[PDB]
């Protein structure tokens, strides 16, 4: 039993009750998964594993979620439970590498209490010494746990991560595992946020990626759909898998902004007002504008510390002694220097000592004990800077967000927003909200982002909007409403660079991403095709260095170029490598300073994706030096010494 789509084959063995995935390669196939068992329900702590094969219907010519393609419907039965499983797989004639999966269960004479449903499980075929993994979970750890994780098959440990999305985790419902020959992405096939895990688990000689959802009681005689997923078989690294997921999710209406609709100002070099921490003043910021303008900065963020309280989002009298006229003198000064002005906020936070909470507690999430629920950190808990959660289904909560947007734009003259330091949304038990279930607040969190952004756009279609779920992958369902992504408080060059590639994969090759400013890593920012930002008040050689790198970024403008993620595979090509095409020229960035993947010795640099019949001069555009005088496009291999990074362009020779 088999179905085919563009670049993928799926086979089912009725005896073993296993699925095997293949991808196309040249005129053949590469096996991507081992024969993998179908996912089952978990009852009393145990996966049910007495399912037997009933039937497998292949339809070679049909139309599904992704349009025309093929379908395989597998029916199985469990004598012990009375459950009949229907497992549906769909392929697409057009969508490369993608398999859509949906499962339902029917109960027999007795109700069945399921604690969890394992949807699909794929163990990688052909792994050797390591597997690289993309982990979209929102459970933390915050900041210092890499989203990209190496699963070492030669060490003592066994990698295991759940990758959760729930009331304490709001990130990206996707995981990928890959090797030299490519990999397998699994992601939640839902147009809206729901509770899901995409676990990544090392096995005896490989690793497996899976997806699953919370259980429920299946009433006797009833049929229920328990969850739907996309799988992507792909060559190369996580970028190819994540791009497949992006393409798949278009069919569910989760559509990221098209290049033509992204505002110019979302590609601009930006400085953010942290030069004095919480001790910024309006005049300190204004005092920097002449030098920032001269050096090529076109955008300014008024960062944290400007407001009385979250929720209220009123001007702090200490920072704005003259009220709104002070906010205006700030944004006017910014505008007079040819720049746009952004304002920091924390969406979903209604404060604790806010007027908002005092006057309108009914707008807030209520916990199971009847108390106001705090906004959670990743994996649970809160922190002192996070207030009470606004319930996304309370009209007054949403209106308070819209009113802030309108005030900041129309009264204070701001041109956009930097949302930050918020993660998931607690479950709500307020009976006045008439929730379908308590998880409804969590599921609808993204409504706050959507409605806020729609209000922003009504004031100015070129408004900037960014949300940093700091130290975690961004809330996937916020992504449609953004004009720029930050890599989100990365704590290393490895984190910032590898995340640029992930977000490009999910958002589009022209979608603006910034490498952020947690540490000074100008070469990382430029070479990945990211927007270079900064927050420090610099002097001496550090100031010179910023000016230098602004100059470079403003010359090559790779932030506006077409990111190319499919030529090099992170962890398998000799260097951590990034590629951008800008104004018809190929730019390459090779790094060795990322301790998570850095070569022994001095491997040759290979430039991929050039015209095989053309000759190129390879120019280090940072130092303005030729590193290779003439390479043919079909053998663009050279060796040059560099300690940390090499940023080059391939200039065609005529
Ligand atoms: Cl990472
Ligand atoms: Mn291991
Ligand atoms: Zn509520």
From Swiss-Prot:
One of its GO terms (molecular function) is alpha-galactosidase activity. Optimum pH is 6.5. The active site is at 420 (nucleophile), 489. Its EC number is 3.2.1.-. Residues 263-527 are annotated as: Glycoside hydrolase 36 domain. It catalyses: an alpha-D-galactosaminyl-(1->3)-[alpha-L-fucosyl-(1->2)]-beta-D-galactosyl derivative + H2O = D-galactosamine + an alpha-L-fucosyl-(1->2)-beta-D-galactosyl derivative. Transmembrane segments: none annotated. 5 ug/ml of this enzyme pair converts A blood type to O blood type in an hour, and can be removed by centrifugation, showing the pair can be used for production of universal type donor blood. The keyword Transferase does not apply. Keywords: Glycosidase, Hydrolase, Signal. Has an N-terminal glycoside hydrolase 36 domain with a probable carbohydrate-binding domain in the C-terminus. The C-terminus is not required for activity on soluble substrates but increases efficiency of cleavage in red blood cells. One of an enzyme pair that work together to convert the A antigen to the H antigen of the O blood type, which together release galactosamine. Catalyzes the second step in the conversion, acts on the product of the first reaction (FpGalNAcDeAc, AC P0DTR4). Is specific for galactosamine containing sugars, does not cleave GalNAc residues. Belongs to the glycosyl hydrolase 36 family. DNA was isolated from a male human fecal sample of AB+ blood type, the sequence was given to UniProtKB by the submitters. This is A type blood alpha-D-galactosamine galactosaminidase. It comes from Flavonifractor plautii.
């Amino acid at each position: 039993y088999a179905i085919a789509g563009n670049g993928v084959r799926v086979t089912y063995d009725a005896d073993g009750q296993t699925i095997t995935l293949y991808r196309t390669e040249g005129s053949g196939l590469i096996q991507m998964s081992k024969p993998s068992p179908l996912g089952g329900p978990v009852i009393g702590g145990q996966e049910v594993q007495d399912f037997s094969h009933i039937s497998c219907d292949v339809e070679q010519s049909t139309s599904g979620v992704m349009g025309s393609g093929q379908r395989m419907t597998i029916t199985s039965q469990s004598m012990s439970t009375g459950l009949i499983r229907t497992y549906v797989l769909e392929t697409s004639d057009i969508e490369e590498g993608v398999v859509y999966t949906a499962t339902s269960y029917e109960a027999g004479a007795s109700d069945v209490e399921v604690s969890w449903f394992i949807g699909s499980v794929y163990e990688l075929y052909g792994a050797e010494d390591r597997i690289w993994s993309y982990n979209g979970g929102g459970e933390g750890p915050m900041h210092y746990y890499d989203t990209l994780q190496k699963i070492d098959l030669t060490d003592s440990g066994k990698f295991s991560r759940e990758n959760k999305q729930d009331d304490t985790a709001a990130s990206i419902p996707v995981s990928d595992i890959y090797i030299a020959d490519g990999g397998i992405t699994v992601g939640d096939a839902s147009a809206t946020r729901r509770e899901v895990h995409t676990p990544v688990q090392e096995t005896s000689d490989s690793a497996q990626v899976s997806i699953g959802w919370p259980g429920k009681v299946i009433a006797a005689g009833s049929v229920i759909e328990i969850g739907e997923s996309f799988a992507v078989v792909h060559p190369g690294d996580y970028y190819n898998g994540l791009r497949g997921y992006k393409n798949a999710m278009d069919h569910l209406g989760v559509i990221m902004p098209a290049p033509g609709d992204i505002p110019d100002s979302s590609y601009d070099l930006r400085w953010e007002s942290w030069g004095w921490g919480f001790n910024w003043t309006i005049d300190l910021i204004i005092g920097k504008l002449d030098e920032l303008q001269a050096a090529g900065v076109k955008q300014i963020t008024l960062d944290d510390g400007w407001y009385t309280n979250a929720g209220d989002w009123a001007l702090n009298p200490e920072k704005f002694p003259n009220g709104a006229s002070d906010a205006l003198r700030l944004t006017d000064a910014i505008h007079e220097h040819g720049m746009t002005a952004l304002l920091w906020w924390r969406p979903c936070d209604g404060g604790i000592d806010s007027i908002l909470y005092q006057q309108h507690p009914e707008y807030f999430v209520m916990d199971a004990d009847g108390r106001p629920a705090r906004l959670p950190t990743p994996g649970g808990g809160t922190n002192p800077s996070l207030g009470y959660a606004l319930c996304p289904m309370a009209d007054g909560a949403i209106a308070s967000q819209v009113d802030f947007v309108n005030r900041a734009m129309n009264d204070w003259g701001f041109d956009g927003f930097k949302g930050a330091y918020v993660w998931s949304m607690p479950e709500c038990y307020n009976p006045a909200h008439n929730h379908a279930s308590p998880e409804e607040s969590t599921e609808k969190q993204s409504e706050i982002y959507r409605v806020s952004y729609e209000a922003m756009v009504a004031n100015d279609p070129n408004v900037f909007n960014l949300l940093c779920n700091c130290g975690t992958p961004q809330d996937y369902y916020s992504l449609p409403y953004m004009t720029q992504i930050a890599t989100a408080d990365p704590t290393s060059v490895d984190q910032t660079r590898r995340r640029v590639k992930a977000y490009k994969a999910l958002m589009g090759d022209y979608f603006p991403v910034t490498a952020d400013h947690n540490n000074i890593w100008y070469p990382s920012a430029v070479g990945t095709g990211s927007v270079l930002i900064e927050k420090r008040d610099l002097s001496g050689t550090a100031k010179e260095e910023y000016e230098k790198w602004l100059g470079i970024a403003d010359t090559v403008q790779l932030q506006k170029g077409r990111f190319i993620g499919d030529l090099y595979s992170y962890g398998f090509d000799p260097y951590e490598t990034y590629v951008v095409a800008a104004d018809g020229v190929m730019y390459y960035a090779f790094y060795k300073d990322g301790s998570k993947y850095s070569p022994t010795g001095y491997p040759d640099i290979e430039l991929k994706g050039l015209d095989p019949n053309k000759m190129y001069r390879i120019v280090d555009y940072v130092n303005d030096r030729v590193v290779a005088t003439n390479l043919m496009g079909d053998n663009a291999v050279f060796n040059t010494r560099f300690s940390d990074y090499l940023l080059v362009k391939a200039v065609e020779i005529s």
